[PDB]
Structure formats: structure tokens, C-alpha cells
């Protein structure tokens, strides 16, 4: 999922910059991550693997390491029926 969650901005996210630049351990805003970026990525990658990042983790520090959301949207998977 996390090499998914920063792939998927090449392809839905409208990012300035080419994916390949940044990474998980990198700030994905220092490439130019709007919220336009963002909410393309969501969209896509609900489809992509099961669901978007939720509000809880959205307004967050989370997108500034890629590694660190993904253990946050794993978490859901652990009990979505449960939330």
C-alpha cells in the first residue's frame, strides 16, 4: 500500500512534480502536494487497493511521511466494520 499510496500521485495526483523525486522518508508538499494532489490521490486510491485516508488522518502531520499514514490506513483495514 505504501509504495501505492505515493505511486498513484503520478497517475490521479496532480502533482508539479515527478513522482520519482520523492519518497516516504521525503515531505511530498516540498514537490508541490496541493490539496487538489490530495484529494485526486483519495479517489484513486480507494479504488486502487479498498478505501481513501479519512478525515482523522487527512488534517494531519501523516502525508508528511508516507511510512507513518500507511500504518494509519492499515489500522482500518484491522477493523473497518468497527469504525
Same mark, same amino acid.
Given at each position: 500500500?505504501? %509504495?501505492?499510496?505515493?505511486?498513484?500521485?503520478?497517475?490521479?495526483?496532480? #502533482?508539479?512534480?515527478?513522482?520519482?523525486?520523492?519518497? =516516504?522518508?521525503? =515531505?511530498?508538499?516540498?514537490?508541490? #502536494? &496541493? &490539496?487538489?494532489? &490530495?484529494?485526486?490521490?483519495?479517489?484513486?486510491?480507494?479504488?486502487?487497493?479498498?478505501?481513501?485516508?479519512?478525515?482523522?488522518?487527512?488534517?494531519?502531520?501523516?502525508?508528511? &511521511?508516507?511510512?507513518?499514514?500507511? =500504518?494509519?490506513?492499515? #489500522?482500518? #483495514?484491522?477493523?473497518?466494520? %468497527?469504525?
Amino acid at each position: 500500500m505504501n %509504495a501505492t499510496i505515493r505511486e498513484i500521485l503520478a497517475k490521479f495526483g496532480q #502533482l508539479p512534480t515527478p513522482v520519482d523525486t520523492i519518497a =516516504d522518508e521525503a =515531505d511530498l508538499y516540498a514537490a508541490g #502536494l &496541493s &490539496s487538489f494532489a &490530495s484529494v485526486q490521490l483519495m479517489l484513486g486510491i480507494e479504488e486502487a487497493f479498498d478505501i481513501e485516508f479519512p478525515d482523522n488522518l487527512l488534517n494531519r502531520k501523516s502525508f508528511a &511521511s508516507i511510512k507513518a499514514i500507511e =500504518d494509519t490506513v492499515k #489500522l482500518i #483495514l484491522d477493523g473497518k466494520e %468497527a469504525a
